[PDB]
């Protein structure tokens, strides 16, 4: 409900399919073609229309909004760009797979080394799991050397990062890419790939996706004068490599030198994507530490999958010491003015409540009653602290206002440990001075608490459904009789018991 209204139907995912980014799809999803070399346009302020900080990709600047989606930074997720490489390059993750696939079928014609006459091939095809089919095809095709064309199949060996054929010639990315381009759909299915989506020509990298600055954290350790992440530096190095690869194809230069520079660009992109590469050094930063490749960003303790997240402002809970108060109802809780001001409840402006809500807004966040933030329909958050014109603010219907915690507001209240279901109950707020929560004596027994310094936790619902659920299900009077032993759990205790005796 906190999000601005969207007419799109709200559903849930039931199947996620890992595929491959085809270059045409990479271009389609990219918001703008990017070719300009460096980040800064002319050292004359503003982002470069064609730089690594292109505003079309979605910046991370608070005062600036992404031009593609038109949303604010609180809603803009960022947008992708694509960098086209003139020379197609291998994929470091798939180079062993590239060699395995090259050894799978005949590179001369694109056909399998064995036909369907073998019942084992028919069984592998009929196997539902593509992994088992691929494994069976590889196991039963390694022994067979002749293809299904009379041409001897050269053996592909991985030397460093290059692939060499033993019939001989060095494997070239253009010819390999064309060889995949000649693969029939039935050979695509037999190999374990999907002709429509997981089409085996996608392991050839021709265009690389540059992500928005949201993906990598560019920490602003000091105002405007900042550096960049290792990913940005490696992307710049890759672009320089691609530029000097492009600039060495129309002019006369040795072919082996051209291939060596191409392998240089390949190693650049490999170190950018994969850090722990076997048999070759990793990309080391100027400080000597390895460059944090994107492969390690999702693996390991430093990886995001195990868990690493930061950055949010949540203040919807409190915890403090308590004391007794005989002058409170059974369902009332005393709340300090400071705690009430710290917490807030977002109320939507209607015709009935507009007057008192405008009064609360005019009061400001430093006085009780009052409000802290005003959210527009689109989601802009006006902070009343920095808005010196709060006395000249009008509110339209549908706007939200985060007002102070007020009387009779249902709040959830808990003691640790919460052994039983009535250790957490919904109370009505009464705002009173000084810095202790106040409770009725009779509810201390179900809480199993005393006022010798024990601490209690408080939560505030942020929606009408939650407020109604707290007021109709977790209310204090509803918890007087427990289902454990069909007897009341709250009774007259201590001074009141002695006095009534």
């Amino acid at each position: 409900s906190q999000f601005p209204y969207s007419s799109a139907p709200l559903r849930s995912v039931k199947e996620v399919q890992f595929g491959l980014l085809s270059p045409e799809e990479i271009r389609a999803i990219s918001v703008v073609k990017i070719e300009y070399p460096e980040i800064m346009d002319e050292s004359r302020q503003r982002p470069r229309e064609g730089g690594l900080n292109d505003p079309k990709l979605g910046s991370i600047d608070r005062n600036f909004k992404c031009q593609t989606c038109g949303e604010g930074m609180a809603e803009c997720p960022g947008h992708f760009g694509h960098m086209e490489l003139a020379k197609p390059v291998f994929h470091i993750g798939f180079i062993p797979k590239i060699k395995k696939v090259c050894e799978c079928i005949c590179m001369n014609c694109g056909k399998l080394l064995l036909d369907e006459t073998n019942p084992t091939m028919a069984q592998a095809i009929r196997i539902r799991d593509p992994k088992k089919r691929f494994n069976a095809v590889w196991q039963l095709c390694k022994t067979k050397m002749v293809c299904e064309c009379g041409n001897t199949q050269p053996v592909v060996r991985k030397d460093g990062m290059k692939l060499w054929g033993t019939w001989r010639k060095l494997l070239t990315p253009g010819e390999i890419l064309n060889v995949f381009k000649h693969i029939s759909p039935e050979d695509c299915f037999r190999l374990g790939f999907n002709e429509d989506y997981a089409r085996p020509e996608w392991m050839i990298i021709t265009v690389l996706p540059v992500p928005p600055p949201q993906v990598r954290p560019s920490i602003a350790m000091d105002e405007t004068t900042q550096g960049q992440d290792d990913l940005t530096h490696k992307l710049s190095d890759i672009l320089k490599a691609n530029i000097n690869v492009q600039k060495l194809e129309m002019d006369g230069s040795p072919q082996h030198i051209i291939n060596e520079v191409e392998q240089l660009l390949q190693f650049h992109v490999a170190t950018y994507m994969d850090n722990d590469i076997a048999g070759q050094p990793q990309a080391l930063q100027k400080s000597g530490r390895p460059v944090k490749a994107i492969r390690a960003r999702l693996k390991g303790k430093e990886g995001r999958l195990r868990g690493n997240l930061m950055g949010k402002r949540v203040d919807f809970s409190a915890r403090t010491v308590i004391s007794g108060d005989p002058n409170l109802e059974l369902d009332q809780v005393g709340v300090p003015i400071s705690i009430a001001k710290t917490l807030s409840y977002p109320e939507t402006v209607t015709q009935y409540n507009i007057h008192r809500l405008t009064e609360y807004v005019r009061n400001g966040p430093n006085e009780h009653p009052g409000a802290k933030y005003v959210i527009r329909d689109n989601g802009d958050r006006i902070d009343l602290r920095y808005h010196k014109r709060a006395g000249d603010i009008v509110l339209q219907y549908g706007w939200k206002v985060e007002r102070h915690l007020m009387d009779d507001d249902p709040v959830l209240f808990n003691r640790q440990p919460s052994l039983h279901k009535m250790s957490m109950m919904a109370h009505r707020v009464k705002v009173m001075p000084y810095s202790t929560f106040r409770l009725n004596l009779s509810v201390t027994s179900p809480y199993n608490a005393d006022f010798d310094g024990d601490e209690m936790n408080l939560h505030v619902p942020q929606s009408e459904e939650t407020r109604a659920e707290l007021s109709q299900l977790c209310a204090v009077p509803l918890q007087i009789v427990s289902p454990q032993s069909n007897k009341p759990v709250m009774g007259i205790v201590q001074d009141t018991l002695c006095g009534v005796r």
Partner: protein
């Protein structure tokens, strides 16, 4: 193909506390976002109070779909459900 006939309904005719809470919450949300109000407003401004007033007069334009364990469901109008 799965709906139960109205005369063949076998569930309880009373409004359970969970159903009451959900109906009150949903009606309060709808009223809070400027939905038309089915009952006159005397002096109250709280959406939950208005929702409770509507419920007391059986003026809730909502239908409960009680799901049987197999997958079938029964449709009950909030007007035809007994409220204590």
């Amino acid at each position: 193909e799965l709906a139960i006939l109205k005369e063949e309904r076998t569930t309880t005719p009373y409004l359970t506390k969970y159903e009451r809470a959900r109906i009150l919450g949903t009606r309060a949300l709808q009223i809070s976002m400027n939905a038309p109000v089915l009952v006159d407003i005397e002096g109250e401004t709280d959406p939950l109070q208005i929702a409770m007033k509507e419920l007391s007069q059986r003026k809730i334009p909502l239908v409960i779909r009680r799901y049987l364990p197999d997958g079938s469901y029964e449709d009950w109008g909030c007007d035809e459900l007994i409220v204590d």
